[PDB]
Coordinates of C-alpha atoms in Angstrom, one line a residue:
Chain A
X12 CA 17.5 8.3 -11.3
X13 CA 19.4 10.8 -8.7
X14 CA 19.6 8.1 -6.0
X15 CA 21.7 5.3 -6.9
X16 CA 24.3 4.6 -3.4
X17 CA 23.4 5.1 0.1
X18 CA 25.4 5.6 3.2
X19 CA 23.5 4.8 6.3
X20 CA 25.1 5.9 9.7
X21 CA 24.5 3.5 12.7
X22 CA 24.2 0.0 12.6
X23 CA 21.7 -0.5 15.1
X24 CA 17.7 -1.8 15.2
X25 CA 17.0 1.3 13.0
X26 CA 20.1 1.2 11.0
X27 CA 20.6 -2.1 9.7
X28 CA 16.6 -2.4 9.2
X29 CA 17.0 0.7 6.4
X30 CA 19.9 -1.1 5.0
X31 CA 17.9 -4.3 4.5
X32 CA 14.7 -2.5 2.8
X33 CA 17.3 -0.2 1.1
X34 CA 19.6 -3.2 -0.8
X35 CA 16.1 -4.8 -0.9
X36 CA 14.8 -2.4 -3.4
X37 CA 18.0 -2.7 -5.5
X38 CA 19.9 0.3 -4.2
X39 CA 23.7 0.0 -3.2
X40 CA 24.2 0.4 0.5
X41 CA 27.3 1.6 2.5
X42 CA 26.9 0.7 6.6
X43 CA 29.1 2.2 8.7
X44 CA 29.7 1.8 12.7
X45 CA 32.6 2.6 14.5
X46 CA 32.0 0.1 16.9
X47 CA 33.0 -3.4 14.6
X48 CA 31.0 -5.8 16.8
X49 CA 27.4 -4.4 16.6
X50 CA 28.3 -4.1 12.9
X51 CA 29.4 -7.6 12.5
X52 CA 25.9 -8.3 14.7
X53 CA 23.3 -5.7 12.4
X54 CA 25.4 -7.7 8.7
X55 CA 24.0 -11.5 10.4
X56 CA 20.5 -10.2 11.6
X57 CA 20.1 -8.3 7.9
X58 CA 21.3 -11.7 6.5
X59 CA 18.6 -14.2 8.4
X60 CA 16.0 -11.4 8.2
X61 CA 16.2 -11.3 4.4
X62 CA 16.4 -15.2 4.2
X63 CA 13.6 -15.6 6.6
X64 CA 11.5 -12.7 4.7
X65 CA 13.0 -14.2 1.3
X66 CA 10.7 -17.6 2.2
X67 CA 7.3 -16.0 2.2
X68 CA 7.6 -14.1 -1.5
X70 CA 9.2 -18.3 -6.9
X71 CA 11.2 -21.0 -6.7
X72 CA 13.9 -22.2 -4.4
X73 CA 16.5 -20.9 -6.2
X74 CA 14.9 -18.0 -7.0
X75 CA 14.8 -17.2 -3.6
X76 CA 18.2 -17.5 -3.1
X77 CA 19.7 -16.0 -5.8
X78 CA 17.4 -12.5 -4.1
X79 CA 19.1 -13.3 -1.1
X80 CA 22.6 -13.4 -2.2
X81 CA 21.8 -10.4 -4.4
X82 CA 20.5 -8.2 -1.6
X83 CA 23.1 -8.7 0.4
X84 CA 25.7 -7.8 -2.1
X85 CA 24.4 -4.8 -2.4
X86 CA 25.5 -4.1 1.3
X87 CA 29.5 -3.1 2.1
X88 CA 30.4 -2.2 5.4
X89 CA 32.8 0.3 6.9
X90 CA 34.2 1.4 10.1
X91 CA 34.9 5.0 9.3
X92 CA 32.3 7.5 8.9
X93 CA 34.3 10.2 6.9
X94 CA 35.3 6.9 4.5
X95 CA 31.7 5.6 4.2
X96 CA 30.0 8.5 3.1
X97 CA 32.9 9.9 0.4
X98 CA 30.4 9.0 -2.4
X99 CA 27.2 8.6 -1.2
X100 CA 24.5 10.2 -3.2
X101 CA 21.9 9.8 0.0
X102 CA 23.1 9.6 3.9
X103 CA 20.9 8.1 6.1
X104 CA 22.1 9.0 10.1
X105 CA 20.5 6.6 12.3
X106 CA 22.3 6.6 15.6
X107 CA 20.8 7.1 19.3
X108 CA 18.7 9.8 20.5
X109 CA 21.4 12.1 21.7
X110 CA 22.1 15.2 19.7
X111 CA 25.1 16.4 20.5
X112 CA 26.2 12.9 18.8
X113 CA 24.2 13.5 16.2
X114 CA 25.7 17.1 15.6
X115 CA 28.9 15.7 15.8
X116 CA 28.0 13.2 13.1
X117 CA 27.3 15.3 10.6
X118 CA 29.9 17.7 11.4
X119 CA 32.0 14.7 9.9
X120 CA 30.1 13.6 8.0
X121 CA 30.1 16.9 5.8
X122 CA 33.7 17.2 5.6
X123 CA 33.6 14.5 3.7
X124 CA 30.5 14.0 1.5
X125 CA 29.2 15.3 -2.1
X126 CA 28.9 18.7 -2.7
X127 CA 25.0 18.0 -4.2
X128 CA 24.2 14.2 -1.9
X129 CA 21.4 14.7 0.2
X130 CA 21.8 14.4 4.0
X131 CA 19.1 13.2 6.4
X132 CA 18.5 11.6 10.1
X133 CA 16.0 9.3 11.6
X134 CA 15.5 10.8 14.6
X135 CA 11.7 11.6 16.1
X136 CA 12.9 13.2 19.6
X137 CA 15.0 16.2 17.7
X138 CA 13.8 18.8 15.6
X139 CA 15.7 19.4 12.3
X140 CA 16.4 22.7 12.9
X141 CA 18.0 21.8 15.9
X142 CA 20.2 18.6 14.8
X143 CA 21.0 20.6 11.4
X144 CA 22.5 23.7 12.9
X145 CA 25.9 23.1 12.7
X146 CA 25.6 22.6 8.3
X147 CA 26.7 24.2 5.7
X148 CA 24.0 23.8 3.3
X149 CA 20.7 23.1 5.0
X150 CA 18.8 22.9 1.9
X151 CA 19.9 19.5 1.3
X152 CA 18.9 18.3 4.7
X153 CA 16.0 16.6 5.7
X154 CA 14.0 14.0 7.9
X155 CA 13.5 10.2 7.3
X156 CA 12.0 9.0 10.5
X157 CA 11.2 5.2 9.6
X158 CA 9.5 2.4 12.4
X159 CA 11.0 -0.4 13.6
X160 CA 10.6 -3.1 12.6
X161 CA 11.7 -1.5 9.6
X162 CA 11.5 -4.3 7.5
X163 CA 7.8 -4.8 8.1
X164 CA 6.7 -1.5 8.9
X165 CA 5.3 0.4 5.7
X166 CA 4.6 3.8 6.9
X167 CA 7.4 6.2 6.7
X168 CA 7.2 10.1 7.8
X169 CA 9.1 12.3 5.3
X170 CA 10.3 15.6 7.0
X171 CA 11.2 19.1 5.2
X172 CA 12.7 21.8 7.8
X173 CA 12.5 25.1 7.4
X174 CA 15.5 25.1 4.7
X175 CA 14.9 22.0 2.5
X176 CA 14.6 22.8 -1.0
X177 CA 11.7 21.1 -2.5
X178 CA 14.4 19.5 -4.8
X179 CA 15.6 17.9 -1.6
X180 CA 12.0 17.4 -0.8
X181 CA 10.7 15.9 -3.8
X182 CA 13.9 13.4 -4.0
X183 CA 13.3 12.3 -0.4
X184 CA 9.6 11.7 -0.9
X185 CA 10.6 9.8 -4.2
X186 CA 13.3 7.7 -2.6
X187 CA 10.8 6.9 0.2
X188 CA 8.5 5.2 -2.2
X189 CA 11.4 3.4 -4.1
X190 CA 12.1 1.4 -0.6
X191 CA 8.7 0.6 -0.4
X192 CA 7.3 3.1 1.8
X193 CA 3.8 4.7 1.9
X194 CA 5.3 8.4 3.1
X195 CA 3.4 10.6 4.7
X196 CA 4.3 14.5 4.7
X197 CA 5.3 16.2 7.4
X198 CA 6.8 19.8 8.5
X199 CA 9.4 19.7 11.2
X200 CA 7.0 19.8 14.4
X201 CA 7.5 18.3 17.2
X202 CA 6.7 14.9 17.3
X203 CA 5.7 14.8 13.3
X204 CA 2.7 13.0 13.4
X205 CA 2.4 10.1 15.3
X206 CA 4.5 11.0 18.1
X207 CA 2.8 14.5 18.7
X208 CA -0.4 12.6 18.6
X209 CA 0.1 9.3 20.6
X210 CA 2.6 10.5 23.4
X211 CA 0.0 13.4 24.4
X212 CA -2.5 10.7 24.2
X213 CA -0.7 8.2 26.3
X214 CA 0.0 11.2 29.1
X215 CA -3.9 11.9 29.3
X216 CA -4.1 8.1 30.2
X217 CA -1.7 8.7 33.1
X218 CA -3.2 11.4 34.2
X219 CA -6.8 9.6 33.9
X220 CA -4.8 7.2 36.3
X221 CA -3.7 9.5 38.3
X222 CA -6.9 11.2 38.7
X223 CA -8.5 7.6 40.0
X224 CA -11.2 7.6 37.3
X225 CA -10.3 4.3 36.2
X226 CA -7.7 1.7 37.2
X227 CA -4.6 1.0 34.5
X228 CA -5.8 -2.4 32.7
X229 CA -9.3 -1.3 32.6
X230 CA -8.0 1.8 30.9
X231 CA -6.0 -0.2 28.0
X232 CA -8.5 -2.9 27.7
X233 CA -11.4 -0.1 27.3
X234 CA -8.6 1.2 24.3
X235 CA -8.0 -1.8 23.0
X236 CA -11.8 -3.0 22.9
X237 CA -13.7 0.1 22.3
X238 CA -11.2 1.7 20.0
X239 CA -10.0 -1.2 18.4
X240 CA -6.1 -0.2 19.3
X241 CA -3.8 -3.2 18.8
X242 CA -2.4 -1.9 22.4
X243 CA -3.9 0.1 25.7
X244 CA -2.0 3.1 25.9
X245 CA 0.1 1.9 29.3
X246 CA 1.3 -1.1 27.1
X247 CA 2.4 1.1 24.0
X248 CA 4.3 3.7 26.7
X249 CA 5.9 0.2 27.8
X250 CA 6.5 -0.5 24.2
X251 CA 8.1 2.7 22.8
X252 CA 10.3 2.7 26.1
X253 CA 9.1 5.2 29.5
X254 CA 12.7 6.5 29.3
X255 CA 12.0 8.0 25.6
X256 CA 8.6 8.9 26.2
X257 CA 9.6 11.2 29.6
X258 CA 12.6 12.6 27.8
X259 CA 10.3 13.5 24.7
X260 CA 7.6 15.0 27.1
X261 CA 10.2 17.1 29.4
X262 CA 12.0 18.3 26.4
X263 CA 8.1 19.7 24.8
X264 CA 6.9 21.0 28.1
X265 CA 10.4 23.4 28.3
X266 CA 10.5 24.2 25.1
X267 CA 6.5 25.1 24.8
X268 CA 5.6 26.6 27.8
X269 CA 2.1 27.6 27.4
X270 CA 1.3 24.0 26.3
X271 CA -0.7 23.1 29.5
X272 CA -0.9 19.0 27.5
X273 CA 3.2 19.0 27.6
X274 CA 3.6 17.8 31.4
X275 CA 5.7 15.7 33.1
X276 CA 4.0 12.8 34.9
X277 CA 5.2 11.9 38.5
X278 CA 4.1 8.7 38.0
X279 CA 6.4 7.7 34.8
X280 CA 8.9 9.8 36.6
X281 CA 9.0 7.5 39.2
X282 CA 9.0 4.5 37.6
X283 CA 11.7 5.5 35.2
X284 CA 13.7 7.1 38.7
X285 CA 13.4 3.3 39.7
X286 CA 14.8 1.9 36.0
X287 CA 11.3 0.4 35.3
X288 CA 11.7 1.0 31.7
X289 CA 9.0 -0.5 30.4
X290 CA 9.7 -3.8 27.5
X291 CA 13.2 -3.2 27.3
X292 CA 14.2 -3.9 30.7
X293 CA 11.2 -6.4 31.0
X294 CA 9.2 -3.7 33.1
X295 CA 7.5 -0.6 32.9
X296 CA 3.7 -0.5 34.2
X297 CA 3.8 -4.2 33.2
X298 CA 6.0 -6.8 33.8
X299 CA 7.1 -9.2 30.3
Chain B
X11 CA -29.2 -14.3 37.1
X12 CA -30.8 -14.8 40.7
X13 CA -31.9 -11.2 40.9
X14 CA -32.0 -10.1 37.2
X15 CA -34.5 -12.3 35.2
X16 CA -35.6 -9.3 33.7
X17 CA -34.6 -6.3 31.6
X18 CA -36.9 -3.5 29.5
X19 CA -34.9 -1.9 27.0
X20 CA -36.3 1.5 26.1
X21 CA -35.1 3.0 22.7
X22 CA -35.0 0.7 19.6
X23 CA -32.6 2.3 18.0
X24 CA -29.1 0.5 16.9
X25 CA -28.0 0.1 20.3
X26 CA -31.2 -0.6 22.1
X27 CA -31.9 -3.3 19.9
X28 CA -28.3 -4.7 19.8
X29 CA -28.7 -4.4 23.7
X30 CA -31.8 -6.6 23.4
X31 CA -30.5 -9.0 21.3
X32 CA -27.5 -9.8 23.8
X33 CA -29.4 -10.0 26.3
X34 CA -31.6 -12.1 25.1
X35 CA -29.5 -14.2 23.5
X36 CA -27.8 -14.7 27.0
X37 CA -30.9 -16.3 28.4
X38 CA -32.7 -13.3 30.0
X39 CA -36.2 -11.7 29.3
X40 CA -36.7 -9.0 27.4
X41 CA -39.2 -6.4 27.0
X42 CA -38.2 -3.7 23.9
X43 CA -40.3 -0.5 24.3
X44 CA -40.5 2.7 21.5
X45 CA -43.6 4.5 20.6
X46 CA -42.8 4.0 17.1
X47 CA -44.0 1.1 15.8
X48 CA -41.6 1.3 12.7
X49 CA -38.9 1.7 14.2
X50 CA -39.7 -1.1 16.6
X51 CA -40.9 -3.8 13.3
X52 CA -37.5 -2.8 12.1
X53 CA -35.7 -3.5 15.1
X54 CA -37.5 -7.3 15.5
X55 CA -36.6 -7.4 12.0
X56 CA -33.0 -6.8 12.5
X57 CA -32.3 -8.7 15.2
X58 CA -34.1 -12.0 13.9
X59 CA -31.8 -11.9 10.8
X60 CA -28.7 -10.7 13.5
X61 CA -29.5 -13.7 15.3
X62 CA -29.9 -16.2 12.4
X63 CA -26.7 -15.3 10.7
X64 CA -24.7 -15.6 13.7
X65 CA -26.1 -18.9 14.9
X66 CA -24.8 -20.5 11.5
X71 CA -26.2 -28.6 13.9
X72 CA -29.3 -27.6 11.5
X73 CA -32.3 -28.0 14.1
X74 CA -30.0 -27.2 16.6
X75 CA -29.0 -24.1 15.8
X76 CA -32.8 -23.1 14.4
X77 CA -34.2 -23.9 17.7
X78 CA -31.5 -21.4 19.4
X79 CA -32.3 -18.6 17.1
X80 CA -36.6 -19.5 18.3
X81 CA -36.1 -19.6 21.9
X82 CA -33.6 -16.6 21.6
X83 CA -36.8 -14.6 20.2
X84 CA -39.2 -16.2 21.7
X85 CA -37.2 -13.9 24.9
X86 CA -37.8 -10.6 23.1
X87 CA -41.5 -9.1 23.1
X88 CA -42.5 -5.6 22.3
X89 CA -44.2 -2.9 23.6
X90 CA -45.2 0.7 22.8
X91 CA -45.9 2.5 26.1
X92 CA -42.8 2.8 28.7
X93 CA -45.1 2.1 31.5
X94 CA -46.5 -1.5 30.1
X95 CA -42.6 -2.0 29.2
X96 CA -41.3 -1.4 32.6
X97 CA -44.3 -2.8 34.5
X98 CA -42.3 -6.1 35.9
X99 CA -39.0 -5.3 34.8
X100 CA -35.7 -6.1 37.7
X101 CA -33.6 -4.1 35.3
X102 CA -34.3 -0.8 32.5
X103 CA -31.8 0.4 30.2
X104 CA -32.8 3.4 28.4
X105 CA -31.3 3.6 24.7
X106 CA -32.9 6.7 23.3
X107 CA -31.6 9.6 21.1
X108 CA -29.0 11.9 22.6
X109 CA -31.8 14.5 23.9
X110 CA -31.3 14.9 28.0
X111 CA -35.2 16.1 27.8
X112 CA -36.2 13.1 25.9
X113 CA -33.8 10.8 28.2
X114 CA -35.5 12.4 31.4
X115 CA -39.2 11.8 30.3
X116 CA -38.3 8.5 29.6
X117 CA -36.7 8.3 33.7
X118 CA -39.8 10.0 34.5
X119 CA -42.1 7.7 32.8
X120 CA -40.3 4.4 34.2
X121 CA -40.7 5.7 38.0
X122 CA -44.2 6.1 38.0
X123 CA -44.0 2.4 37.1
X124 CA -41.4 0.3 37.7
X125 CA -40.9 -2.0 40.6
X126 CA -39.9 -1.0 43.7
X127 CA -36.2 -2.4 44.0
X128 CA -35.5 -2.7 39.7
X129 CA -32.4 -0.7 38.4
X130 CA -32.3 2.0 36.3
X131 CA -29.7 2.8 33.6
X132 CA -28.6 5.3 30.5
X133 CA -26.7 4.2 28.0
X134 CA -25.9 7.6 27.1
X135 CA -21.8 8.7 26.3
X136 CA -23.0 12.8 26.0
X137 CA -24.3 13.8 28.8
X138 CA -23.0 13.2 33.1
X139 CA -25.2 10.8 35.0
X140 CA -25.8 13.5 37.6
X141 CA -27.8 15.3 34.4
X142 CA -29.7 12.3 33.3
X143 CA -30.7 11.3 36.9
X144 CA -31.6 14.6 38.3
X145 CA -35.4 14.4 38.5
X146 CA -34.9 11.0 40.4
X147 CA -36.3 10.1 43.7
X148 CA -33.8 7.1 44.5
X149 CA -30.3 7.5 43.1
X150 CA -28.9 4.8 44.7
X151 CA -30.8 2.4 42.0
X152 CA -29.2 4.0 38.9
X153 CA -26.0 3.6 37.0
X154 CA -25.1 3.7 33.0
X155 CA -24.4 1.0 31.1
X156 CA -22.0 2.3 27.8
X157 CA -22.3 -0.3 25.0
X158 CA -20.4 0.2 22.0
X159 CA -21.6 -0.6 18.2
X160 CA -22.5 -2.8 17.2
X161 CA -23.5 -4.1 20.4
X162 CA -23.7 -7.8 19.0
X163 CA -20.2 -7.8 17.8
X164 CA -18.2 -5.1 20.5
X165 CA -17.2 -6.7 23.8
X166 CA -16.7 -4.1 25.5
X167 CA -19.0 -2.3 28.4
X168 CA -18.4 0.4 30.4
X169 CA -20.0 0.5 33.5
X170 CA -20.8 3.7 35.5
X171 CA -21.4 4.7 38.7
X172 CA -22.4 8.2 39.5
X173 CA -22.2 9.9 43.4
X174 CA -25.0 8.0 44.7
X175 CA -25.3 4.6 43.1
X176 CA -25.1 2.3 45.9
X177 CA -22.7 -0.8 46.1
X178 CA -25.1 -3.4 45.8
X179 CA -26.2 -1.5 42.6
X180 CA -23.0 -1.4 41.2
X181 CA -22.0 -4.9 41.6
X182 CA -25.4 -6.1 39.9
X183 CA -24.4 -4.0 36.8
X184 CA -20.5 -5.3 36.4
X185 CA -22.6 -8.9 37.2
X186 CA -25.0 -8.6 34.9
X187 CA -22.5 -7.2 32.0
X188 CA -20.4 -10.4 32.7
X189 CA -23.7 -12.3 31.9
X190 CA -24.2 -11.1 28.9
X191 CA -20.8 -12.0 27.6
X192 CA -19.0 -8.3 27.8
X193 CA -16.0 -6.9 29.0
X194 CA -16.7 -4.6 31.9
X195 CA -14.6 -1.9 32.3
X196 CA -15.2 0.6 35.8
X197 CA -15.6 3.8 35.9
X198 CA -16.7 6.9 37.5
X199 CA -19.2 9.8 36.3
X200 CA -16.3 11.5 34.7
X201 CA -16.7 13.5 31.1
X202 CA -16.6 10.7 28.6
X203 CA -15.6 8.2 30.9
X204 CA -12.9 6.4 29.6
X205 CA -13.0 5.9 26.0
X206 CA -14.7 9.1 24.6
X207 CA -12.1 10.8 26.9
X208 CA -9.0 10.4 25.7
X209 CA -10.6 9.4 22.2
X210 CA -12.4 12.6 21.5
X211 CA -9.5 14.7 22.7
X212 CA -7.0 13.0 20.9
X213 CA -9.0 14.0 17.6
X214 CA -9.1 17.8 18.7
X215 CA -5.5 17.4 18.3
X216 CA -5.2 15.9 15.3
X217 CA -8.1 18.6 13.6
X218 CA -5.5 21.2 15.5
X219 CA -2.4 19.5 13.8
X220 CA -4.4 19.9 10.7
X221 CA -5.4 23.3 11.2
X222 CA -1.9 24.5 11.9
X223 CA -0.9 23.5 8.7
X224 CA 1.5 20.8 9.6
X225 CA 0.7 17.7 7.8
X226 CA -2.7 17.2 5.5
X227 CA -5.6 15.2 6.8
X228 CA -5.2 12.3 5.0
X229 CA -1.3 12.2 6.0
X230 CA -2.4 12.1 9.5
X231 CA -5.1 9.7 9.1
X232 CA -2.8 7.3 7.0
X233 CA -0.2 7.5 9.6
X234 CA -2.1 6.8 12.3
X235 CA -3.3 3.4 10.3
X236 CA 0.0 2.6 9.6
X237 CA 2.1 3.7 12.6
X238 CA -0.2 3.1 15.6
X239 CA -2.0 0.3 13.8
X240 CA -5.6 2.0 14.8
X241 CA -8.7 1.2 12.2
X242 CA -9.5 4.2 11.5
X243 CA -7.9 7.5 11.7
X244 CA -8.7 10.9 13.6
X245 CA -10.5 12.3 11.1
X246 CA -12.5 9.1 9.8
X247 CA -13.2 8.4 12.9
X248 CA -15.0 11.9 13.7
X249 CA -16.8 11.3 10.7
X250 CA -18.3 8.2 12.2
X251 CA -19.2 9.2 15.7
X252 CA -20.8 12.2 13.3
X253 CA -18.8 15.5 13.9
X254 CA -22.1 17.2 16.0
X255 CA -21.4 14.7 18.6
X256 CA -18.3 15.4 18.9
X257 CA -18.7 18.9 18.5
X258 CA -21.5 18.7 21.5
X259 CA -19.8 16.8 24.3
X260 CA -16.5 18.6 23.3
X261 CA -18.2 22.3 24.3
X262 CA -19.8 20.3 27.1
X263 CA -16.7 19.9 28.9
X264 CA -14.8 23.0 27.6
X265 CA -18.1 24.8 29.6
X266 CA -17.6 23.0 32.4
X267 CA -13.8 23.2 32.5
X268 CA -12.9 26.3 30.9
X269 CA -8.9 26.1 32.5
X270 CA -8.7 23.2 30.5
X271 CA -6.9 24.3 27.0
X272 CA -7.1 20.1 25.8
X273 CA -11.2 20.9 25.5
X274 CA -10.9 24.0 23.1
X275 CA -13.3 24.3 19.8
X276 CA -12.3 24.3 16.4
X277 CA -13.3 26.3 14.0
X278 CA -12.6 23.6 11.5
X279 CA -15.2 21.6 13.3
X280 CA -17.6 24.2 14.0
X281 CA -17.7 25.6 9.9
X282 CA -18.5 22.3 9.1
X283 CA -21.4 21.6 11.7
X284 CA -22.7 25.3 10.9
X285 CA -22.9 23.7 7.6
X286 CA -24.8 20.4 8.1
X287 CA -21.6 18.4 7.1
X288 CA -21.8 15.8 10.4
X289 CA -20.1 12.9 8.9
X290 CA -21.3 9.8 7.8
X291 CA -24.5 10.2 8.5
X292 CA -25.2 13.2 6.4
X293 CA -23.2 11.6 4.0
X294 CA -20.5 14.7 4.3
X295 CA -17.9 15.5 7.0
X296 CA -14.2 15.3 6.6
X297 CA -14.9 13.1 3.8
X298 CA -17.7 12.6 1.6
X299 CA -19.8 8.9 1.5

């Protein structure tokens, strides 16, 4: 009912995968970058995503009429303050870097609805933190989906310290519209997952470190004994070493008498040397 | 194998007998040795009908699941089990006095050169080994459940296993068509170490108040694509175990703030609520 048009705020992997599950499920989606090319990339990978997903699910028309349906349900803009004028929901879904992210909705609030709810994706922030500059906090809150965000069902649903349980309820609501299975969570750091499996992946390392077992013994015991679709030096290489250090540093400054939040020199030196794990095609292993 | 032609299992629980049927199944000889002849009737029993449904060419295939048994006998006295065995493995309950009169029952008869193993996960090597008179000849030898079905071994040496010890366990876990993984007598080795841990967090997540318990189970499902989550998966090893081994190592390594108890944990092991096999825990079954 409250929900009706969404602005989402970055067209990147993130971005453009909540737009497709968003116009998907029948909402109206706004999509606005400042940079036009990655825009003009994230509206072609949405359009063969929902055509190649649109295969699997009636006949052939019926597929395509979905197609052409979901994607007129997606409008494009290169101006934040323009895109997000009448948004009842705004989705920011930009890069890890919060000063960007503050900025953001610094515009993004001189320009929305007095009552449309506000939200970002990120997992590396706390709310408190990227909300700090707003007006009204009680609208804000956390939507921290997984890419790939069309296939991915699980979505964490994040209340700081000031969302009204109006804001809450709407959120956890609009969550399960998209086709989500949401999953509660105060703003902690790390949510869930994160503040489970990054800890978990550093007590690998340091297992390494320590010389009780070797690296691919280690994620083969994970992946055989615990049944884990990856060994923990494989899903480090997956989520990227560069997000996992930064995430680690930023918990062992901010929680000093954590003695689990601690840097690792060996991920240290492998990210010192660019080893980045899949995204530069190495990390502990090489793809 | 040239030196291994044959292994007594002692212990006919669920993994001794899995143990033995692996092994037999991989062409070796078996002796399986419990002084309960129940328990051991129920093992045979088990791993006949194990056997049969995995084998399903219609003689061919009933003539695998015969010679595959005709590998396995049975015995009710450690000393008879042991008596010509290259190889034991002891499988018994996780009780270091139990596991010890079993070590010291097999060196008053084994032979000379055979190895000994535990297939413990609660207790250090060093522990279960103590009374021994040659360390050099012993080593553990982690299956995981059910042993038929798991691939994976972990294979441990403690301070004194020798090398030629070693390399006849990693061997001989090859030969029975498992996964070895190395490791060192370390607390939990590799899996139950950063397993066990990682659900301390969780229960701590939990008991902060954070996020609810099925939440964090359904996330880790759905985000990290595990089988089971933290606090299903407690409920399964059975919460005393983990309870057990986890004040194990925060005893032994009290500057390390990762091995702290819970009280969620410890309320419901005071109670009797161990998990699945008390059919309470975390969840009820």
């Amino acid at each position: 009912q409250n929900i009706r048009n969404v602005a989402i705020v970055g067209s990147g992997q993130m971005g453009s995968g909540i737009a497709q599950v968003t116009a998907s499920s029948g909402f109206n989606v706004m999509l606005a970058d400042v940079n036009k090319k990655a825009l003009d990339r994230a509206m072609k990978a949405i359009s063969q995503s929902v055509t190649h997903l649109s295969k699997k699910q009636g006949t052939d028309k019926e597929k395509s009429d979905f197609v052409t349906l979901t994607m007129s349900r997606i409008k494009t803009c290169n101006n934040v303050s323009t895109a997000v004028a009448d948004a009842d929901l705004i989705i920011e879904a930009a890069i890890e870097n919060i000063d960007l992210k503050r900025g953001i909705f610094a515009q993004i609030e001189q320009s929305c609805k007095k009552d449309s709810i506000l939200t970002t994706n990120t997992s590396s922030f706390l709310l408190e933190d990227v909300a700090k500059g707003l007006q009204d906090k009680t609208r804000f809150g956390g939507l921290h989906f997984f890419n790939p965000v069309p296939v991915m069902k699980l979505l964490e649903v994040i209340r700081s310290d000031d969302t009204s349980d109006e804001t809450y309820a709407t959120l956890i609501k609009f969550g399960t519209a998209v086709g989500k299975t949401t999953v509660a969570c105060k703003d902690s750091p790390g949510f869930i997952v994160n503040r489970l499996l990054i800890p978990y992946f550093f007590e690998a390392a340091r297992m390494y470190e320590r010389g009780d077992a070797s690296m691919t013994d280690i994620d083969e015991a994970m992946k055989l004994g615990a049944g884990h679709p990856m060994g923990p030096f494989e899903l480090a290489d997956y989520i990227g070493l560069d997000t996992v250090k930064f995430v680690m540093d930023g918990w062992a400054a901010k929680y000093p008498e954590v003695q689990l939040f601690e840097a690792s020199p060996l991920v240290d030196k492998l990210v010192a040397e660019g080893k980045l794990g899949r995204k530069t095609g190495d990390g502990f292993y090489s793809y």
